[PDB]
Structure 1
Amino acid sequence: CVSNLMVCNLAYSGKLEELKESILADKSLATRTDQDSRTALHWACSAGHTEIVEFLLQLGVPVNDKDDAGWSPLHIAASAGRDEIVKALLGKGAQVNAVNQNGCTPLHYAASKNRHEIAVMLLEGGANPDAKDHYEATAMHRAAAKGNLKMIHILLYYKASTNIQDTEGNTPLHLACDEERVEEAKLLVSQGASIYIENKEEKTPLQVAKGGLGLILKRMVEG
């Protein structure tokens, strides 16, 4: 029972037939916003109900409206891992470089939650891989820190930068090293991530690294 508007609950529940029934009675309900500034579309994205999303999109409804927290439908769908809803959303003009109130794009959440195929869709649909959030962090920061090896390959293929620094001065390499993400750190270094950049604490990814991972990285770069 996630909303104060019944239509929204019907979209979350997946009750497509009473959702259509409410909306023939009152066309306005397909775009009416609840207390979180969400419509039926947001909630159907959240629950992954593709047929209900597809129905609303045909109806002509807005695709890019952000809720109280700044989440667009695309944000919700990318995060929740709704492969086909993302596809539909993008097909209907969804904004791929949309930002929520923390400064996150959909790709940030795809990267973080390991959504490989959604990441590909977003990037192939025009997403900026170097988009920085309010802490100046990228998708690559998130992938490196979580240890998402395949996601890093994706980001790198679509020309993500490896040496962007967050508010703390850390690059993705710093984070990979800090979380003992070995293969992810080697991958980064092999495609040019710097072992020399210092975070705002004056430490390099090597100095942050443990178990002589730093030694491995140092030999990759220096001989």
Structure 2
Amino acid sequence: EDGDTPLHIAVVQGNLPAVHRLVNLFQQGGRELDIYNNLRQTPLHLAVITTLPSVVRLLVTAGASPMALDRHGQTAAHLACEHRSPTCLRALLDSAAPGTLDLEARNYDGLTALHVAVNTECQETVQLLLERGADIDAVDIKSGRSPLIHAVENNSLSMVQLLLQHGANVNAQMYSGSSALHSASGRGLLPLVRTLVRSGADSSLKNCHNDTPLMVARSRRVIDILRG
């Protein structure tokens, strides 16, 4: 009945023994493990939110779906990344049966788990996602930007270097035709300009305004990096 969630409560209380007991009780009763509270969270969602990798493992092995969406369309992988929890992300990926967990899932905003991870500045979740097959060039509908472009706009030299190291397309363009280099160049982000150029960014690429990164260059310093 409504308003009582013994399983959700057992999870938030970090009581694995009680979760175990309840999982068995729900199963024997034929009940769904992926039942929602009023916040549209499943017990598995809450296991990730509470950072309980052992409970994550238990629920997933018991049949809880890593693709169940929360109120914002987040999968369990999205939530692990939101909560900067490499251990929960690992528990999910390792415990999920093959063919059940898709890392290309887009939440309601349109982002993949990789986009979320890049935005949190957590190198650990980003690396694990890529190691497990996340599309490094995935483009969300809202922004039209790859994770690389997101990192550049966040002015995160660490995420930029990490993505490039894992084979990110340095010449991905947004809807307007601007690349990561246009962004770094127009905003005077020197360290990022250096890295992108050295990594092979195309400085002759024209956007919708017919501008190259050189043409939007903010300062004589950026300009000089771009000329070589």
TM over 0.5: yes
Corresponding residue of 1:57: 60
Corresponding residue of 2:7: 7
Opposite residue 202 of structure 1, the aligned amino acid is N
Whether 2:46 is the aligned partner of 1:38: answer: no
Corresponding residue of 1:213: 221
Deviation, 1:137, is: 0.6
Please identify runs of 4+ aligned residues in structure 1 that moved more than 6 A.
Answer: none
Match of 2:205 among 192, 197, 200: 197
**8 Å CA contact retained: 1:64, 1:73:** yes
Which stretch has the larger CA shift, 11-20 or 58-67? 11-20
Deviation, 1:18, is: 4.5
Corresponding residue of 1:74: 77
Opposite residue 164 of structure 1, the aligned amino acid is A
1:65-144 aligned at under 5 Å gives the runs 65-93=68-96, 94-134=101-141, 135-144=143-152
Aligned sequence identity (%): 25
SS in 1 for 2:36: coil
Match of 1:164 among 157, 172, 175: 172
Opposite residue 31 of structure 1, the aligned amino acid is D
RMSD of Structure 2 on Structure 1 (CA): 2.4
Deviation, 1:29, is: 6.0
Which stretch has the larger CA shift, 146-155 or 107-116? 146-155
Deviation, 1:107, is: 0.8
Whether 2:163 is the aligned partner of 1:155: answer: yes
Which stretch has the larger CA shift, 23-32 or 42-51? 23-32
**8 Å CA contact retained: 1:145, 1:181:** no
Alignment length (residue pairs): 218
Structure 1: distance between partners of 2:172 and 2:4: 42
The gaps in structure 2 that reach 5 residues or longer are none
Structure 1: distance between partners of 2:90 and 2:198: 32
